[PDB]
């Protein structure tokens, strides 16, 4: 039950010359047949291939000071940003990795950064050693990401990154980690490496590698950053990762005693090729493509070609000629990153099912025996013949100038076992949310512009995939935005709206907060005929509604009563929609730090908090609302825009609620009200459709009777902190007896007071759990008084009791920082390749 388990490549990232800043841009360069040879930049201080942004670093993203960033070797910084991008390609939000066996293996050597004396002004003392010692290149990644498997920096020159891959594959097979980042980085800071190869006469004047060409006259120095994410195939499939290829086998060895430390030996190259085949249990006939070391040196190219001839050339059998190429023909010699660059080239190929081409410049080298016809240069895009197995495979080679050699077999990934897919809460409406996050607003804007450009340049991409990917395969940062969209084109328009600062429907913006969420249960006038009907397909919701039907009939003979009103029906139905909407938020991941209610709302809130069972909570609102129909006739209520005290004629009307700084309820005698009302026809007052006045003495008649009816209820300790609008503070759920429920009907509702307290205590998000926003505007006004940044949210709305509205609410709750379990909401779609985090890099170059 143990063997060389296949290792899977689940992500990849690279920064390479020729303006390549992602695997996909590398594909463009290779199919274009453009190269990157250009003159050395002046901004370094002393022809070749150079990275666009070698010295740019989003230092603030990773919490690194600008002084330390200036001291960090540009290789340390590329490795750190490219590691991040690789995990994003694997679809792993890097936070989930903190405390993980994840290992880091970085191939690298020294390139002459920070060799002068430190200009004291720059103030890099205390940072320069750590910014430039090899082990830190790998240790820093594990520090910044909280990774806890092995972290090593390895130097074998040109093969460094393939040796790092080889080591990570053993680490994974051995149990030393369960996920690994492996790759290499180089940035030619100083001119020492270029100078030594010039002196040797090893560099083409072009700056271009002409691999296997008659025009080969030396290699072109390059640089870059190339990283893959490795995982044992079993763990990959079990976690449903998107496998890009697999390392079927790999090998490492040494030239030994060649003719000069740098001299190449074809025999060594053959043996390393053959150990790889052995580890992978294949023969050369099973490999259609070879991505060679391929540096364009007159004497080395034939050495490499003779060993391919002696290995891949023989017994090709059924398999036609082997295709041969080298990515150095487009980007130059990327030194410590050369190997994995090659590996990312063949992986791009596997995606598209074709053999990646090479910039063939001129005629084949006359020094190579092509007479067998068994090796062909990959001149343009070609068919990738599977092997007799039906498996496509490639071979990648890196032969370092210190004599250590590597060869790796990359194979297409096996077919995944199909698994039963999880269900998506909320019926499908074609509308999908697409969420964005960055560490600043400029970065947030840039993310949105890039997603829009990608989706415009890549249409046909399934919006469900962009939705799932940006919610499940990306980390959520401080500054957020979300865009509802029914089809790709509507996404681009609204993503551009985020990008350019436009307010537009279907687009929301917000900052994520530490503080808790408070569920506001209003009651009052949240009802509308036909409410929340479109949510009865949702089992979480429908089930709550059904159990509510059971216990209502037993206590009031009533039920759904919305297949197609009056106070002792409306209140038992608004109770039911509110505890149901609450359970729906719960099952979508919004967990309440506290519950608060307005009058009857407090009964749904006590249920939602666990202080009263669903049964007792129904009985309390059924026999509280039957008891109010018994003091009908005389009595009514009115809303009065304008704050209390100013509204505070006596003995017939009194203040019965306070809802915000600019909103009060007054109640008392029916006629007496019309009096106040038509008085104000000359304040924006308005009367509530009521035949009685609660929170007044008109209710003392039903006291004792109510208290009795609800004497069998059993208040329990709450699971969620219940804030009493009566007491004005937190209250053990045992204290919610009939007395409390009478005193709730009689005493005045100090709701503005409670919202002020909860704002004082630092709660961040108020979610009105109701079929129509009733208190939301009043709460929003209270927060403006306290000059607060707390956010207020509705759930459903009249003409909006649909899933599309709850989806909108989920989108806004998440944008404010409420934890939406997007897995439970958008089930589990596939991972699509979308732009990475939009690093806001500044230049640092000592």
């Amino acid at each position: 039950e143990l063997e060389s388990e296949p290792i899977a490549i689940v992500g990849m990232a690279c920064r390479l010359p020729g303006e390549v800043d992602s695997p996909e841009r590398l594909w463009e360069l290779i199919t274009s047949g453009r190269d990157s040879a250009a003159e050395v930049p002046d901004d370094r201080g002393w022809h070749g291939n150079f990275m666009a942004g070698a010295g740019d670093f989003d230092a603030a993203f990773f919490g690194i000071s600008p002084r330390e960033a200036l001291a960090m070797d540009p290789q340390q910084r590329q490795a750190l940003e490219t590691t991040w991008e690789a995990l994003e390609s694997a679809g792993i939000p890097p936070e989930t990795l903190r405390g993980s066996d994840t290992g880091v293996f970085v191939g690298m050597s020294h390139q002459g950064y920070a060799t002068g004396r430190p200009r004291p002004e720059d103030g890099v003392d205390g940072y320069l050693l750590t910014g430039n010692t090899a082990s830190v290149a790998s240790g820093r990644i594990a520090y910044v990401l909280g990774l806890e498997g092995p972290a090593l920096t390895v130097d074998t020159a040109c093969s460094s990154s393939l040796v790092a891959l080889h080591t990570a594959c053993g680490s994974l097979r051995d149990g030393d980690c369960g996920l690994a980042v492996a790759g290499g980085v180089s940035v030619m800071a100083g001119p020492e490496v270029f100078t030594e190869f010039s002196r040797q006469g090893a560099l083409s004047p072009d700056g271009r590698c002409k691999p296997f060409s008659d025009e080969a006259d030396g290699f072109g120095l390059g640089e870059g950053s190339a990283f893959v994410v490795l995982q044992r195939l079993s763990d990959a499939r079990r976690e449903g990762r998107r496998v890009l290829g697999v390392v079927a086998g790999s090998a490492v060895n040494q030239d030994g005693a060649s003719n000069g430390l740098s001299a190449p030996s074809g025999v060594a190259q053959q043996r390393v090729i053959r150990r790889a085949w052995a580890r992978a249990g294949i023969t050369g006939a099973d490999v259609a493509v070879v991505e060679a070391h391929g540096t364009g040196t007159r004497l080395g190219d034939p050495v490499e070609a003779s060993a391919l001839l002696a290995t891949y050339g023989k017994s090709r059998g059924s398999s036609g000629p082997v295709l041969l190429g080298s990515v150095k023909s487009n980007i130059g010699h990327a030194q410590a990153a050369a190997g994995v660059a090659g590996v990312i080239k063949v992986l791009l190929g596997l995606e598209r099912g074709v053999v990646p081409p090479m910039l063939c410049r001129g005629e084949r080298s006359g020094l190579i025996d092509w007479s067998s016809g068994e090796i062909e240069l990959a001149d343009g895009v070609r068919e990738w013949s599977p092997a007799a197995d039906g498996v496509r495979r490639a071979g990648v080679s890196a032969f370092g100038v210190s004599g250590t050699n590597a060869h790796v077999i990359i194979a297409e990934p096996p077919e995944p076992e199909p698994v039963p897919q999880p269900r998506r809460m909320l019926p499908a409406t074609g509308v999908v949310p697409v969420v964005l996050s960055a560490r600043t607003g400029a970065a947030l804007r840039a993310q949105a512009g890039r997603l829009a450009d990608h989706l415009a340049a890549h249409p046909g991409i399934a919006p469900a995939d962009v939705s799932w990917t940006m919610a499940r395969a990306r980390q959520h940062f401080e500054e957020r935005a979300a865009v509802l969209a029914a089809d790709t084109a509507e996404a681009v328009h609204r993503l551009r709206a985020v990008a350019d600062g436009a307010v537009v429907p279907g687009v929301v913006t917000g900052s994520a907060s530490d503080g808790g969420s408070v569920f506001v249960f209003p009651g009052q006038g949240a009802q509308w005929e036909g409410m929340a009907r479109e949510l009865l397909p949702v089992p979480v919701f429908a089930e709550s509604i059904a159990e509510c039907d059971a216990v209502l009939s037993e206590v009031a003979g009533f039920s759904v009563s919305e297949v197609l009103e009056r106070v002792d029906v409306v209140q038992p139905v608004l109770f039911a929609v509110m505890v149901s909407l609450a359970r729906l938020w719960r099952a979508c991941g919004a967990v309440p730090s506290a519950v608060i209610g307005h009058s009857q709302g407090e009964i749904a809130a006590a249920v939602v908090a666990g202080a009263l069972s669903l049964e007792d909570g129904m009985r309390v609102v059924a026999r509280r609302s039957r008891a109010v129909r018994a003091v009908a006739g005389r009595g009514s209520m009115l809303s009065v825009r304008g704050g209390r005290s100013d509204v505070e004629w006596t003995g017939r009307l009194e203040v019965a609620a306070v809802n915000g700084p600019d909103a009060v309820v007054v109640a008392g005698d029916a006629q007496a009200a019309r009096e106040f009302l038509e008085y104000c026809e000359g304040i924006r007052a308005r009367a509530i459709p009521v035949d009685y006045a609660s929170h007044t003495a008109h209710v003392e008649p039903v006291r004792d009777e109510l208290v009795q009816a609800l004497a069998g209820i059993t208040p329990r300790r709450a699971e969620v902190p219940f804030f009493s609008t009566l007491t004005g503070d937190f209250l053990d759920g045992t204290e919610l007896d009939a007395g409390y429920w009478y005193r709730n009907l009689r005493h005045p509702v100090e709701f503005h007071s409670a919202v002020q307290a909860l704002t004082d205590q630092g709660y961040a998000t108020f979610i009105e759990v109701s079929p129509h926003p009733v208190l939301a505007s009043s709460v929003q006004e209270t927060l403006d008084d306290a000059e607060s940044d707390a956010a207020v949210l509705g759930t459903l709305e009249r003409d909006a009791g649909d899933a599309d509205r709850f989806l909108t609410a989920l989108a806004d709750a998440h944008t404010r920082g409420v934890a939406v379990d997007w897995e439970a909401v958008l089930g589990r779609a596939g991972l699509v390749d979308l732009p990475g985090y939009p690093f806001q890099g500044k230049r640092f170059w000592l």
Partner: antibody
Amino acid sequence: QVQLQQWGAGLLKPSETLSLTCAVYGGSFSGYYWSWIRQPPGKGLEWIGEINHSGSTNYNPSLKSRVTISVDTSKNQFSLKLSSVTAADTAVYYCARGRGSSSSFDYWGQGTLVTVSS
Amino acid sequence: ETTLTQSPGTLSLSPGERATLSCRASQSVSSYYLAWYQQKPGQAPRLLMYGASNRATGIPDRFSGSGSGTDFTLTIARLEPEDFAVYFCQQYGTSPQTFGQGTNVEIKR
């Protein structure tokens, strides 16, 4: 209250077509997901399909090719048709109320034994 | 399809004892989409638990449901006579809604 009654031909010959119907009494046919669930003898139950008062259906892929369920909203009734029957289909067929698409079932029919023999 | 394997085959006990009925899924399922049923013989199933742990209206409080991803459990505090029956779990989170093969709960003598 709520109560379910189903009727239909119990005995069938192979290659024929099972046809049962269920009647809902007192319930709100609107908003619930009326469902067929069979149970081969002494075995675990197996979900066939469902339909709401609108006509939206959902069938188990294991039988979709030969199953059809339907509603009559003015009769308050819903029904199962199962083609090309076989002795595999010998089961106790039950109609039931689903609290949401493909959900839990609270109210259940009395069960119709359906025996496919020759 | 997701598979539900119930355990044990047939738990025997006597009235009063505590019966613990278990159910293992072939893959993880949200707790919101698991259910428990009782089936007295020659009758229909009767819903006991929905959403893993929520007791259906009218079900005595001695029936307790619990469990998470893959492993869920139904527990009766005190076996009363009318409880001796067969019990079925049901997952309804994977597209194909599926049911346990069943566990008998017989009289021990």
